[model samples]
Target: KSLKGSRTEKNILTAFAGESQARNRYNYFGGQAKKDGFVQISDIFAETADQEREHAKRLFKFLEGGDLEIVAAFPAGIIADTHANLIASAAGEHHEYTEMYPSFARIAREEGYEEIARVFASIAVAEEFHEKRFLDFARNIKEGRVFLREQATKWRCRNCGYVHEGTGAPELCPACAHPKAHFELLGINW
Candidate 1:
């Protein structure tokens, strides 16, 4: 109990990592939207991303004296079409939640990284929640859930980044000849 503050410090470190990753994600989306010719949406994606930076800023208020810094690049992969990329992402989270883990946790514990490994185990639950949310969203979009009028949801062509605003799928993907089924619902809960 000599260093009672060490435990709290680790939690703050984890939170800082989360916020930093989130900042990059929105930045990626915003940049991609602009790359694909959707400036309005790009602006929206870029605009709110700053909020994540604020989260990191607040964390700094707690751990200000530590003269530590890291230079690690979080890897990112960009699928050609954003919707397709989203599906892959949804699948990635699903795989993380269902496939690997405790092995990682166990292995870490075995290797004497106990608390850190256990902390990693906690992340799988968050990934599972994300998978469930995206699974439903992807389903309705692919199934062409007709707009109920108020949602004004966004739909995107799976084959291309062709975007449509409304709850309904387009009769056809204007960018590709894929049928309405080619459309998938897209959303970001930032």
Candidate 2:
């Protein structure tokens, strides 16, 4: 059966559009973070962007191939400082999990595409995780505690995944040698 003119198909296209743009936007934000010396935040953005690309690719599979006239209000232009960018990024991801993808999943379910609906719902959960990551970073930046904490904790190297057990991140990643800025506190927002 042709899915042409179906709402589920349209939703997939809309989601694909957003996800593709999200990947690029995150990369740009990551570059800005690097410029501001927030290398850890930059690395996070890069990793997030890669996942967004994967999401986009997955969503694209549901597309039947055509020019879709999807009308979605892409998040407004993000010309701001790193902190502001992180806040805005979180807002976008939050919307995806709480509103956009949920609605899309409902339509897909209604249209008899159970698998597509599940995919949408699963992506929504992924977006929620992304939102949490962004929120954690933003909160830490605002609180001026990106590197310091009150108790001994585990830090993981973003580049090599080396685990460091300490109150503060190491000066250099013992395994990856990517430097302290690449180390992320373990159990962020967990």
Candidate 3:
């Protein structure tokens, strides 16, 4: 979606709130990952959470300097459900990478902030990667999925050997909280 709107104080506040919500959501997932022993997912979530934090910081800086008003706010319903979280996280990244940031980058360059444009461009690339990662997780966790949900019963975390039982991937090891780097995909077929 376009990041255009009235350059009003209220709009800036809205953007701040939206970005803050994104940061909080990522942090929540990161904490869950730490608890479930999904080290890799935890690390990813943590990294992206930091990115969102930075985005909020930059937006706030702009607002403080009286440059532009934040023009968008996330709807309260956006994160009301788990499935909604999954879908929104995935789709939001897709839109940010494919649509929003590109235009922002163009504007930044036009304003002679090439470095800032580059930064946004890089974030957009990372956002695309995040979208793909989340989409994969969502698809695998869908009902009747053969791998993530079905085969999970027959598989266990390589690090802790904990059975998943169609619950999908654990966030982190409840016992050790080891990051995803320690996890190996294991199944009865092997």
Candidate 4:
């Protein structure tokens, strides 16, 4: 059995990945810029996002003709080859964003559960953000471009179990809006 993909497959994977990140980040940057005062920059970002999306679609057709399998598991801490971990994380987030949440939202709407639909829709939007985040990290690791130069601290919020990495958690938990005193602390010296 072929464990490693062919050269073409590898290129396709990398290209699709970078394209996906470019698409997602630019859209976000564009919208935020538009909301602020950077109209021209926002439109440029939107234009690039569109171009990247088109490239990703064309690359996906090439990928569809081949085979791709992904595997993942529960993690204790900084686990797996970093690049592999990124792919696994990205895949899981993609599944949540593209399949699971969207399907659940649709079913919720069908069942006349508008609140549930909104909840699922909101989380799905978050998952898309996560998918791109992981893809960006994976691409950096793959290209040997990952930058690491800091001692680190981690905190997890009890209310939502959302993690924050820094010298300390933010003034309020971004996930659940819990205050500074609410996070459980952990740290490591890099």
Candidate 5:
């Protein structure tokens, strides 16, 4: 195989493995959170775990194509080579973002496959965010807090009941294709 093909294979394998590990870890964390009396947080973790599993499934499907195969499989004993693993993982994600998906996006765009490209782009963005979150989890934040602050003014779309997170009404309800006049401000506060 060419060098590029080999690298792509390696990236796909590592991403699949990492996503699987993340899903398992998140599930464990979710269970522990629930046991510790944080039901809402546990549910969030469980949802994230499902998302990670979906990511792994997508990668596996991509790899199952004839053009791809597993690459750079190291022995189990070398698993603790943390530096190497981190470097490889970072490089793999970069390659996927900078090369693989962009190439696919270009092809999709040329072929008028906007939806396919959009899905790939959206997942790619989410995956990049996931990588950053993982690095943060490893280095600093153990029990991360997700907080949402409510503004004084919030509007709800009449058509879909979608909440807009802002101090004023939006020009249009992005969620339901409703006009700004259709939004009603909910004044309830905690």
Candidate 6:
């Protein structure tokens, strides 16, 4: 039997595939968010996508570089709107942390690959954070708080340097004539 034939190795490859796809999906969602006029949400998607890339790299580092065939399923978590994308992304991350990574960690531990098990466990924790972050963003959007707060605040136009001072952003930027949906919050909440 070759080193690459081990179950733990196969699990690592599967996880690498999952992480890589997640990174790509997040980037796609981020682009959608940007186009939908949620610049801050788009930025959050980009940041999480970068973290997913890092996770993929860490999983890839454990491979021994040989042809090893493994079967895995890649699902779509994409939508045209950032709100839907955020919800789907949260579900994906939730599955990773709650089911996929835990299973991989257990199998690695059973196969006596303690270090790989530790890595899987650690990555699972990060996935939990991702899940929570996405859920929070989705909830905020659902509750109409993505761009609003309790007190009067400043809103800045992403396309132009126009600043609006009010409890909520204007329907359209007064200075730039751009839609208000793309304006970013200029307060502590942002």
lDDT of 3 at 26: 74
Q: Give the candidate number with the greatest lDDT.
A: 2
TM-score pick, better of 1 and 5: 1
Query: lDDT of each model, Cα atoms only?
Result: 0.56, 0.87, 0.59, 0.56, 0.55, 0.86
lDDT of the structure predicted as candidate 5 = 0.55
Model 4 lDDT at residue 166: 78
| lDDT string, candidate 4, 1-190, tens digits | 2214444344445546655765676676556544543333345457757866775675565554555643323223333443554565567567756875677567656655556456556756765876786677567446633322245667666557788887545678798875654454543469
Ranking under TM-score, best-scoring first?
2, 6, 3, 1, 5, 4
Give the TM-score of each candidate.
Answer: 0.43, 0.84, 0.59, 0.38, 0.42, 0.83
C-alpha positional error of residue 163 in candidate 5 after TM-score superposition, expressed in Å: 17
Q: Is candidate 2 or candidate 5 better by lDDT?
A: 2
| lDDT (10s digit) by residue, model 1, range 13-69 | 555665576667757866765565444434544553575577557555556365444
lDDT-better candidate, 2 vs 6 = 2
For candidate 6, the 10 contiguous residues with the lowest summed lDDT are: 181-190
lDDT by residue (1-190, candidate 2, tens digit) is 5679999888888889999989999999999988776788998899999999999999887677768898888866875788998999999999999999999899888888899999999999999999998999999989877876789988888778899997888888888777677777775564
Off by over 4 Å in 4: 1-79, 148-190
Runs of candidate 2 exceeding 4 Å displacement = 152-180, 186-190
> Residue 104's C-alpha lDDT in candidate 1?
44
Candidate 5 runs further than 4 Å off: 1-5, 65-121, 127-190
What candidate 3 gets wrong by more than 4 Å, as runs, is 1-18, 29-47, 55-68, 143-190
Off by over 4 Å in 1: 1-27, 30-76, 149-190
**What is the Å distance of residue 161 in model 3 from its true position?**
7.7
TM-score result, candidate 3: 0.59
Clashing pairs in 6: none
TM-score of 5: 0.42
